[PDB]
CSV table of C-alpha atoms and ligand atoms in Angstrom, one decimal:
chain,number,residue,atom,x,y,z
A,1,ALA,CA,122.5,-62.8,12.0
A,2,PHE,CA,120.5,-64.8,14.5
A,3,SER,CA,119.9,-62.8,17.6
A,4,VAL,CA,117.9,-63.1,20.9
A,5,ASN,CA,116.4,-60.3,23.0
A,6,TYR,CA,114.7,-61.1,26.3
A,7,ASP,CA,113.5,-59.7,29.7
A,8,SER,CA,116.5,-60.4,31.9
A,9,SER,CA,114.5,-62.7,34.2
A,10,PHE,CA,114.5,-65.3,31.4
A,11,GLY,CA,118.3,-65.3,31.3
A,12,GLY,CA,118.6,-68.7,33.1
A,13,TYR,CA,115.7,-70.3,31.3
A,14,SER,CA,116.3,-72.6,28.4
A,15,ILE,CA,114.6,-71.7,25.1
A,16,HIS,CA,112.6,-75.0,25.3
A,17,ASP,CA,111.4,-74.2,28.8
A,18,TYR,CA,110.3,-70.7,27.8
A,19,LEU,CA,108.4,-71.8,24.7
A,20,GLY,CA,106.7,-74.5,26.9
A,21,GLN,CA,105.4,-71.9,29.2
A,22,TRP,CA,104.3,-69.5,26.4
A,23,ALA,CA,102.4,-72.4,24.7
A,24,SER,CA,100.8,-73.5,28.0
A,25,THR,CA,99.1,-70.1,28.5
A,26,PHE,CA,98.4,-69.5,24.8
A,27,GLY,CA,96.4,-72.8,24.5
A,28,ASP,CA,95.1,-73.6,21.1
A,29,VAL,CA,93.2,-71.1,18.8
A,30,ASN,CA,91.5,-74.0,16.9
A,31,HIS,CA,92.2,-72.4,13.5
A,32,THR,CA,90.5,-75.3,11.7
A,33,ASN,CA,87.9,-75.9,9.0
A,34,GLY,CA,84.5,-74.5,10.0
A,35,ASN,CA,85.9,-72.8,13.1
A,36,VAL,CA,87.6,-69.7,11.8
A,37,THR,CA,86.1,-66.2,12.6
A,38,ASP,CA,87.6,-62.9,13.5
A,39,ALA,CA,88.2,-64.1,17.1
A,40,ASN,CA,90.9,-66.6,15.9
A,41,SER,CA,92.0,-65.6,12.4
A,42,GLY,CA,94.8,-63.3,13.5
A,43,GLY,CA,95.7,-60.4,11.3
A,44,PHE,CA,98.3,-58.8,9.0
A,45,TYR,CA,100.1,-55.4,9.0
A,46,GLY,CA,101.4,-53.5,6.0
A,47,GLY,CA,99.3,-55.1,3.3
A,48,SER,CA,96.7,-54.2,0.7
A,49,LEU,CA,93.6,-56.2,-0.2
A,50,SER,CA,92.8,-57.5,-3.7
A,51,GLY,CA,90.2,-59.5,-5.6
A,52,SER,CA,88.0,-60.0,-8.6
A,53,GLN,CA,85.0,-59.0,-6.5
A,54,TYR,CA,84.0,-56.7,-3.7
A,55,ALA,CA,80.5,-57.1,-2.1
A,56,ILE,CA,78.6,-55.6,0.8
A,57,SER,CA,75.2,-55.9,2.5
A,58,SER,CA,73.1,-53.2,4.1
A,59,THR,CA,73.4,-52.8,7.9
A,60,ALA,CA,70.0,-51.2,7.9
A,61,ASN,CA,68.2,-54.4,6.8
A,62,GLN,CA,71.1,-57.0,6.2
A,63,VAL,CA,69.4,-57.9,2.9
A,64,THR,CA,69.8,-55.2,0.3
A,65,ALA,CA,73.3,-55.6,-1.3
A,66,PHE,CA,75.6,-55.0,-4.3
A,67,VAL,CA,78.4,-56.9,-5.9
A,68,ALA,CA,81.2,-55.1,-7.8
A,69,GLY,CA,83.1,-57.4,-10.3
A,70,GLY,CA,86.4,-56.7,-12.1
A,71,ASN,CA,90.0,-56.5,-10.9
A,72,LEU,CA,90.2,-54.3,-7.8
A,73,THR,CA,92.7,-53.5,-5.0
A,74,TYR,CA,92.1,-51.5,-1.8
A,75,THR,CA,95.1,-49.8,-0.2
A,76,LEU,CA,93.7,-50.2,3.3
A,77,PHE,CA,96.3,-48.3,5.5
A,78,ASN,CA,98.9,-48.0,2.7
A,79,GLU,CA,99.1,-44.6,0.9
A,80,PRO,CA,97.0,-43.1,-0.5
A,81,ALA,CA,95.0,-44.4,2.5
A,82,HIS,CA,91.7,-46.2,2.0
A,83,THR,CA,91.6,-46.0,-1.8
A,84,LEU,CA,89.8,-48.5,-4.0
A,85,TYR,CA,91.3,-48.6,-7.5
A,86,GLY,CA,91.5,-50.8,-10.6
A,87,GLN,CA,89.0,-52.0,-13.2
A,88,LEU,CA,85.2,-52.0,-12.5
A,89,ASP,CA,83.5,-54.3,-15.1
A,90,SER,CA,80.2,-55.1,-13.4
A,91,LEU,CA,77.7,-54.2,-10.7
A,92,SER,CA,74.8,-56.4,-9.5
A,93,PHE,CA,72.0,-55.1,-7.2
A,94,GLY,CA,69.4,-57.1,-5.2
A,95,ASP,CA,68.6,-59.0,-2.0
A,96,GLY,CA,70.7,-61.5,-0.1
A,97,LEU,CA,74.4,-62.4,-0.5
A,98,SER,CA,75.9,-65.8,-0.8
A,99,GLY,CA,79.5,-67.1,-1.5
A,100,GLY,CA,82.7,-65.0,-1.5
A,101,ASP,CA,85.2,-67.7,-0.4
A,102,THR,CA,85.5,-70.9,-2.5
A,103,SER,CA,82.8,-69.5,-4.8
A,104,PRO,CA,82.2,-66.0,-6.2
A,105,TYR,CA,79.9,-63.6,-4.5
A,106,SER,CA,76.4,-63.7,-5.9
A,107,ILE,CA,73.2,-61.8,-5.2
A,108,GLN,CA,70.6,-64.3,-4.1
A,109,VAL,CA,67.5,-62.6,-5.6
A,110,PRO,CA,68.8,-60.3,-8.3
A,111,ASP,CA,67.0,-57.1,-9.4
A,112,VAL,CA,69.3,-55.5,-11.9
A,113,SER,CA,72.9,-55.7,-13.1
A,114,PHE,CA,75.3,-54.0,-15.4
A,115,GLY,CA,78.2,-55.5,-17.3
A,116,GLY,CA,81.0,-54.2,-19.5
A,117,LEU,CA,81.3,-50.9,-17.6
A,118,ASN,CA,84.9,-50.4,-18.6
A,119,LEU,CA,85.6,-48.0,-15.7
A,120,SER,CA,89.2,-47.8,-14.4
A,121,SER,CA,91.2,-45.5,-12.1
A,122,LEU,CA,94.8,-45.2,-10.9
A,123,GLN,CA,96.1,-45.6,-7.4
A,124,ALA,CA,97.6,-42.1,-7.5
A,125,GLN,CA,94.2,-40.4,-8.2
A,126,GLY,CA,93.2,-41.5,-4.6
A,127,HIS,CA,89.6,-40.8,-3.5
A,128,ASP,CA,89.1,-38.7,-6.8
A,129,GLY,CA,89.3,-41.9,-8.9
A,130,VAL,CA,86.0,-42.9,-10.6
A,131,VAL,CA,86.0,-46.5,-9.3
A,132,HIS,CA,86.5,-45.3,-5.7
A,133,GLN,CA,83.8,-42.6,-6.1
A,134,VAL,CA,81.3,-45.0,-7.6
A,135,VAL,CA,81.8,-47.9,-5.1
A,136,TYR,CA,82.2,-45.7,-2.0
A,137,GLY,CA,79.2,-43.7,-3.1
A,138,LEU,CA,77.2,-47.0,-3.1
A,139,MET,CA,78.5,-47.9,0.4
A,140,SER,CA,77.1,-44.6,1.6
A,141,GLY,CA,73.7,-45.0,-0.2
A,142,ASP,CA,74.6,-42.3,-2.7
A,143,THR,CA,74.2,-43.3,-6.4
A,144,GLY,CA,75.3,-39.9,-7.8
A,145,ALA,CA,78.8,-40.9,-8.9
A,146,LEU,CA,77.4,-44.1,-10.5
A,147,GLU,CA,74.7,-42.3,-12.4
A,148,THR,CA,77.3,-39.7,-13.7
A,149,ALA,CA,79.4,-42.6,-15.0
A,150,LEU,CA,76.4,-44.4,-16.5
A,151,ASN,CA,75.3,-41.2,-18.3
A,152,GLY,CA,78.8,-41.0,-19.8
A,153,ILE,CA,78.4,-44.5,-21.3
A,154,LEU,CA,74.8,-44.3,-22.2
A,155,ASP,CA,75.5,-41.0,-24.1
A,156,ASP,CA,76.9,-43.2,-27.0
A,157,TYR,CA,73.5,-44.8,-27.5
A,158,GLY,CA,71.4,-41.6,-27.2
A,159,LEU,CA,70.3,-42.7,-23.7
A,160,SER,CA,70.7,-41.7,-20.1
A,161,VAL,CA,69.7,-42.9,-16.6
A,162,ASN,CA,66.2,-41.6,-17.2
A,163,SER,CA,66.0,-44.3,-19.9
A,164,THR,CA,64.2,-47.6,-19.0
A,165,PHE,CA,65.8,-51.0,-18.8
A,166,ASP,CA,63.9,-52.0,-22.0
A,167,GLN,CA,65.2,-49.0,-23.9
A,168,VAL,CA,68.8,-49.7,-22.8
A,169,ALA,CA,68.6,-53.4,-23.7
A,170,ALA,CA,67.2,-52.5,-27.1
A,171,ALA,CA,70.1,-50.1,-28.0
A,172,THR,CA,72.9,-52.2,-26.6
A,173,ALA,CA,71.9,-55.4,-28.4
B,1,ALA,CA,80.4,-54.2,-24.7
B,2,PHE,CA,78.2,-52.5,-22.1
B,3,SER,CA,75.2,-54.6,-21.2
B,4,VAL,CA,72.2,-54.8,-18.8
B,5,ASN,CA,70.3,-57.7,-17.2
B,6,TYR,CA,67.2,-57.3,-15.1
B,7,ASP,CA,64.1,-59.0,-13.7
B,8,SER,CA,61.3,-58.4,-16.3
B,9,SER,CA,59.3,-56.4,-13.7
B,10,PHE,CA,61.8,-53.6,-14.0
B,11,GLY,CA,61.5,-53.3,-17.9
B,12,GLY,CA,59.6,-50.0,-17.7
B,13,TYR,CA,61.6,-48.6,-14.8
B,14,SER,CA,64.2,-45.9,-15.5
B,15,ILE,CA,67.7,-46.7,-14.3
B,16,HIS,CA,67.5,-43.6,-12.1
B,17,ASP,CA,64.3,-44.8,-10.4
B,18,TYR,CA,65.6,-48.3,-9.7
B,19,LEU,CA,68.8,-46.9,-8.1
B,20,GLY,CA,66.8,-44.5,-6.1
B,21,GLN,CA,64.7,-47.3,-4.6
B,22,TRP,CA,67.8,-49.5,-4.1
B,23,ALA,CA,69.7,-46.8,-2.3
B,24,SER,CA,66.8,-45.7,0.0
B,25,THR,CA,66.4,-49.4,1.1
B,26,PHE,CA,70.2,-50.0,1.4
B,27,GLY,CA,70.7,-46.8,3.6
B,28,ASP,CA,74.2,-45.8,4.6
B,29,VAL,CA,76.6,-48.4,6.0
B,30,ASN,CA,78.5,-45.6,7.8
B,31,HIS,CA,82.0,-46.7,6.6
B,32,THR,CA,83.9,-43.8,8.2
B,33,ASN,CA,86.9,-43.3,10.6
B,34,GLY,CA,86.4,-45.0,13.9
B,35,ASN,CA,83.1,-46.7,12.8
B,36,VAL,CA,84.4,-49.5,10.6
B,37,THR,CA,84.2,-53.1,11.9
B,38,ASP,CA,83.4,-56.5,10.2
B,39,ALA,CA,79.7,-55.6,10.2
B,40,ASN,CA,80.2,-52.7,7.6
B,41,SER,CA,83.6,-53.4,5.9
B,42,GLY,CA,82.3,-55.6,3.1
B,43,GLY,CA,84.6,-58.2,1.6
B,44,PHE,CA,86.7,-59.4,-1.3
B,45,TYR,CA,86.8,-62.6,-3.3
B,46,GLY,CA,89.6,-64.4,-5.1
B,47,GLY,CA,92.4,-62.5,-3.3
B,48,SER,CA,95.4,-63.2,-1.1
B,49,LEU,CA,96.6,-61.6,2.2
B,50,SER,CA,100.1,-60.3,2.7
B,51,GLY,CA,102.1,-58.1,5.1
B,52,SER,CA,105.4,-57.5,6.8
B,53,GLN,CA,103.8,-59.0,10.0
B,54,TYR,CA,101.3,-61.6,11.1
B,55,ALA,CA,100.0,-61.5,14.7
B,56,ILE,CA,97.4,-63.3,17.0
B,57,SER,CA,96.2,-63.4,20.6
B,58,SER,CA,95.0,-66.3,22.7
B,59,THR,CA,91.3,-67.0,22.6
B,60,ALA,CA,91.3,-68.6,26.1
B,61,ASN,CA,93.0,-65.7,28.0
B,62,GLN,CA,92.9,-62.9,25.4
B,63,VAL,CA,96.5,-61.8,26.4
B,64,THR,CA,99.2,-64.3,25.4
B,65,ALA,CA,100.4,-63.5,21.9
B,66,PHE,CA,103.0,-63.6,19.2
B,67,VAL,CA,104.1,-61.5,16.2
B,68,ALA,CA,105.8,-62.9,13.2
B,69,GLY,CA,107.8,-60.5,11.1
B,70,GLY,CA,109.3,-60.7,7.6
B,71,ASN,CA,107.7,-60.8,4.1
B,72,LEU,CA,104.6,-63.0,4.3
B,73,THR,CA,101.8,-64.1,2.0
B,74,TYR,CA,98.8,-66.2,2.9
B,75,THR,CA,96.9,-67.8,-0.1
B,76,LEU,CA,93.6,-67.9,1.8
B,77,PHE,CA,91.3,-69.8,-0.7
B,78,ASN,CA,93.8,-69.7,-3.6
B,79,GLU,CA,95.7,-72.9,-4.2
B,80,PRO,CA,97.5,-74.5,-2.4
B,81,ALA,CA,94.8,-73.4,0.0
B,82,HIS,CA,95.5,-71.8,3.4
B,83,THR,CA,99.3,-71.7,2.9
B,84,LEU,CA,101.5,-69.1,4.6
B,85,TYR,CA,104.8,-68.7,2.7
B,86,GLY,CA,107.7,-66.3,2.0
B,87,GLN,CA,110.4,-65.1,4.4
B,88,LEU,CA,110.2,-65.4,8.2
B,89,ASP,CA,112.8,-63.1,9.9
B,90,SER,CA,111.4,-62.5,13.4
B,91,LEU,CA,109.1,-63.9,16.1
B,92,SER,CA,108.3,-62.0,19.4
B,93,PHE,CA,106.4,-63.5,22.3
B,94,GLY,CA,104.7,-62.1,25.4
B,95,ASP,CA,101.5,-60.5,26.7
B,96,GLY,CA,99.2,-58.1,24.9
B,97,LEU,CA,99.0,-56.8,21.3
B,98,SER,CA,99.0,-53.2,20.1
B,99,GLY,CA,98.9,-51.6,16.7
B,100,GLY,CA,98.6,-53.4,13.3
B,101,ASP,CA,97.0,-50.7,11.1
B,102,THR,CA,98.8,-47.4,10.9
B,103,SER,CA,101.6,-48.8,13.1
B,104,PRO,CA,103.3,-52.2,13.4
B,105,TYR,CA,102.0,-54.9,15.6
B,106,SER,CA,103.9,-54.9,18.9
B,107,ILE,CA,103.8,-57.1,22.0
B,108,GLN,CA,102.8,-54.9,25.0
B,109,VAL,CA,104.8,-56.7,27.6
B,110,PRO,CA,107.5,-58.6,25.7
B,111,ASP,CA,109.2,-61.8,27.2
B,112,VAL,CA,111.4,-62.9,24.4
B,113,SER,CA,112.1,-62.1,20.7
B,114,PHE,CA,114.1,-63.9,18.0
B,115,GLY,CA,115.6,-62.0,15.0
B,116,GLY,CA,117.5,-63.1,11.9
B,117,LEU,CA,115.7,-66.5,11.7
B,118,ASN,CA,116.4,-66.6,7.9
B,119,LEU,CA,113.6,-69.1,7.2
B,120,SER,CA,111.9,-69.2,3.8
B,121,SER,CA,109.5,-71.3,1.8
B,122,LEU,CA,107.7,-71.3,-1.5
B,123,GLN,CA,104.0,-71.2,-2.2
B,124,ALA,CA,104.2,-74.6,-4.1
B,125,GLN,CA,105.5,-76.5,-1.0
B,126,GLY,CA,102.0,-75.9,0.5
B,127,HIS,CA,101.6,-76.9,4.2
B,128,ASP,CA,105.0,-78.7,4.1
B,129,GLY,CA,106.8,-75.4,3.9
B,130,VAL,CA,108.8,-74.4,7.0
B,131,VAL,CA,107.3,-70.9,7.4
B,132,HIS,CA,103.8,-72.4,7.3
B,133,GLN,CA,104.7,-75.3,9.8
B,134,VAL,CA,106.3,-72.9,12.2
B,135,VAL,CA,103.6,-70.3,12.3
B,136,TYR,CA,100.6,-72.7,12.1
B,137,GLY,CA,102.4,-74.7,14.8
B,138,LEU,CA,102.3,-71.6,17.1
B,139,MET,CA,98.7,-70.8,16.3
B,140,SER,CA,97.9,-74.4,17.4
B,141,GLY,CA,99.9,-74.0,20.7
B,142,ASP,CA,102.5,-76.3,19.2
B,143,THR,CA,106.1,-75.1,19.3
B,144,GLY,CA,107.6,-78.4,17.9
B,145,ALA,CA,108.3,-77.0,14.4
B,146,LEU,CA,109.7,-73.8,15.8
B,147,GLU,CA,112.1,-75.8,18.1
B,148,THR,CA,113.3,-78.0,15.2
B,149,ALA,CA,114.1,-74.9,13.2
B,150,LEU,CA,115.9,-73.3,16.2
B,151,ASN,CA,118.0,-76.5,16.8
B,152,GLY,CA,119.1,-76.2,13.2
B,153,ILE,CA,120.2,-72.6,13.6
B,154,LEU,CA,121.8,-73.3,17.0
B,155,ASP,CA,123.8,-76.5,16.1
B,156,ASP,CA,126.2,-74.3,14.1
B,157,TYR,CA,127.0,-72.7,17.5
B,158,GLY,CA,127.3,-76.0,19.4
B,159,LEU,CA,124.0,-75.2,21.2
B,160,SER,CA,120.3,-76.3,21.2
B,161,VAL,CA,116.9,-75.3,22.6
B,162,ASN,CA,118.0,-76.7,26.0
B,163,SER,CA,120.7,-73.9,26.2
B,164,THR,CA,119.7,-70.8,28.2
B,165,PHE,CA,119.0,-67.3,26.7
B,166,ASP,CA,122.2,-66.0,28.3
B,167,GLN,CA,124.3,-68.7,26.7
B,168,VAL,CA,122.7,-68.2,23.3
B,169,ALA,CA,123.1,-64.4,23.5
B,170,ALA,CA,126.8,-64.9,24.4
B,171,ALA,CA,127.5,-67.3,21.4
B,172,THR,CA,125.5,-65.1,18.9
B,173,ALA,CA,127.4,-61.9,19.8
C,201,HEM,C1,98.8,-66.3,8.4
C,201,HEM,C2,98.7,-67.4,9.2
C,201,HEM,C3,97.6,-68.4,8.9
C,201,HEM,C4,97.9,-69.7,8.7
C,201,HEM,C5,99.3,-70.4,8.8
C,201,HEM,C6,96.6,-70.4,8.4
C,201,HEM,C7,96.4,-71.7,8.1
C,201,HEM,C8,95.2,-72.3,7.9
C,201,HEM,C9,95.0,-73.8,7.8
C,201,HEM,C10,96.2,-74.8,7.8
C,201,HEM,C11,93.7,-74.0,7.7
C,201,HEM,C12,92.8,-75.3,7.5
C,201,HEM,C13,93.5,-76.6,7.8
C,201,HEM,C14,92.9,-77.4,8.9
C,201,HEM,O1,91.6,-77.6,8.9
C,201,HEM,O2,93.6,-77.9,9.8
C,201,HEM,C15,93.0,-72.7,7.7
C,201,HEM,C16,91.7,-72.4,7.7
C,201,HEM,C17,91.1,-71.2,7.4
C,201,HEM,N1,91.7,-69.9,7.5
C,201,HEM,FE1,93.7,-69.7,7.9
C,201,HEM,N2,95.6,-69.4,8.4
C,201,HEM,C18,96.2,-68.2,8.7
C,201,HEM,C19,95.6,-66.9,8.8
C,201,HEM,C20,94.3,-66.7,8.3
C,201,HEM,C21,93.7,-65.4,8.1
C,201,HEM,C22,94.4,-64.0,8.3
C,201,HEM,C23,92.5,-65.5,7.7
C,201,HEM,C24,91.5,-64.4,7.3
C,201,HEM,C25,90.3,-64.4,7.8
C,201,HEM,C26,92.2,-67.0,7.6
C,201,HEM,C27,91.0,-67.6,7.2
C,201,HEM,C28,90.8,-68.9,7.2
C,201,HEM,C29,89.5,-69.5,6.8
C,201,HEM,C30,88.3,-68.7,6.4
C,201,HEM,C31,89.7,-71.0,7.0
C,201,HEM,C32,88.8,-72.2,6.7
C,201,HEM,C33,87.4,-72.1,7.0
C,201,HEM,C34,86.7,-73.3,6.4
C,201,HEM,O3,87.1,-73.8,5.4
C,201,HEM,O4,85.6,-73.6,7.0
C,201,HEM,N3,93.3,-67.6,8.0
C,201,HEM,N4,94.0,-71.7,7.9
C,202,HEM,C1,86.4,-52.0,-1.1
C,202,HEM,C2,85.8,-50.9,-1.0
C,202,HEM,C3,86.2,-49.9,0.2
C,202,HEM,C4,86.2,-48.5,0.0
C,202,HEM,C5,85.9,-47.8,-1.3
C,202,HEM,C6,86.6,-48.0,1.3
C,202,HEM,C7,86.8,-46.6,1.6
C,202,HEM,C8,87.1,-46.1,2.8
C,202,HEM,C9,87.2,-44.7,3.1
C,202,HEM,C10,87.1,-43.5,2.1
C,202,HEM,C11,87.6,-44.5,4.4
C,202,HEM,C12,87.8,-43.2,5.1
C,202,HEM,C13,86.5,-42.4,5.2
C,202,HEM,C14,86.6,-41.4,6.3
C,202,HEM,O1,87.7,-40.8,6.5
C,202,HEM,O2,85.6,-41.2,7.1
C,202,HEM,C15,87.6,-45.9,4.9
C,202,HEM,C16,87.9,-46.2,6.3
C,202,HEM,C17,88.3,-47.4,6.7
C,202,HEM,N1,88.1,-48.6,6.1
C,202,HEM,FE1,87.5,-48.8,4.1
C,202,HEM,N2,86.8,-49.0,2.2
C,202,HEM,C18,86.5,-50.2,1.5
C,202,HEM,C19,86.6,-51.5,2.1
C,202,HEM,C20,87.2,-51.8,3.3
C,202,HEM,C21,87.6,-53.1,3.7
C,202,HEM,C22,87.4,-54.4,3.0
C,202,HEM,C23,88.1,-53.0,4.9
C,202,HEM,C24,88.7,-54.2,5.7
C,202,HEM,C25,88.1,-54.7,6.8
C,202,HEM,C26,88.1,-51.6,5.3
C,202,HEM,C27,88.6,-51.0,6.5
C,202,HEM,C28,88.6,-49.7,6.9
C,202,HEM,C29,89.0,-49.2,8.2
C,202,HEM,C30,89.5,-50.0,9.3
C,202,HEM,C31,88.8,-47.6,8.1
C,202,HEM,C32,89.0,-46.5,9.0
C,202,HEM,C33,89.8,-46.8,10.3
C,202,HEM,C34,90.1,-45.5,11.0
C,202,HEM,O3,91.0,-44.8,10.6
C,202,HEM,O4,89.5,-45.3,12.1
C,202,HEM,N3,87.5,-50.9,4.3
C,202,HEM,N4,87.4,-46.8,3.9
């Protein structure tokens, strides 16, 4: 049922009066096209994050970056906490990062990229999942988990991470 | 269907050696407890935002605030774009904002709160939906849509927004 709680000093105020005073001090956040940042976006509680891509740029130089493509969700503060899981199809490495809103993320000056990775992990595996280990590894500048996963795939072609890009392109054609 | 793409200059590079060079230039974003902000969080593309609460503070005075409770989803860049929909149950008003991560949002010095609003809209209604008009209204310092909705609820009690909080509380007991 509809209910109202209030500090007792507002007992004799009308609802209209109160909301007029609240709005007066609040002002206008100007949540409009071209004007939305973290200062006026507001925020959500209780939710997870999802998307066909996750991307991040270096804080050391703000240029070096990677883009993970697939079907990913991140539990954020839901349990198991701070777990990335789902399907990791692709990984692009290079300099500069554009898009991410009404267009996909893209590396501006691409070096190298991998497609058809076919890596997946369940929510319940938590931080032990391969997708989480790979992507979080890369956020921390640690390629070890990625290289272990790539060695697993490349094993089918008699290759490894010590193979060159030309060798890998030759066997996977 | 594993594949690779690369700038021709990396043809004779080993995968291992490329990733070594990428990682040593990327560094470590330091995505750890207490050290995560927007500068080192990364981002997702193609996704939606949801939660049991939405909340926001004034950009002018950094204090006046509200918290909307219920079951909410915001389409973000998915169509119909920038639409808040679902069920709106509660709305609390006052000064200060606490929590939002591992605890619910809460107003620090509450003035007034409304429960059992029982308002709901669909994604397909877009910006015409009542949950969107109410909350976007409040974000714009514009209580008009809220007051229309409250007059609807209150007319079944023979009251309106010009009634006092004591009178509303008496009728809704
Ligand atoms: C949940 C309550 C929210 C509502 C009702 C809402 C509604 C809107 C509306 C109606 C617009 C554009 C229409 C205009 O120009 O008048 C807009 C823009 C935008 N909002 Fe929201 N929004 C909400 C929360 C958020 C959140 C949590 C974010 C996350 C960062 C966000 C990000 C954006 C962005 C990036 C834009 C447009 C930027 C641009 O196109 O230049 N909004 N919002
Ligand atoms: C998508 C890939 C991501 C992965 C794999 C990831 C992983 C992690 C991990 C493992 C932790 C805990 C590490 C520790 O205990 O030191 C953490 C903390 C955190 N992450 Fe993420 N994260 C990702 C993206 C994001 C995003 C998009 C946000 C949203 C802004 C975010 C916000 C946070 C916050 C606020 C904390 C810690 C806050 C605290 O307890 O002090 N992360 N993340």
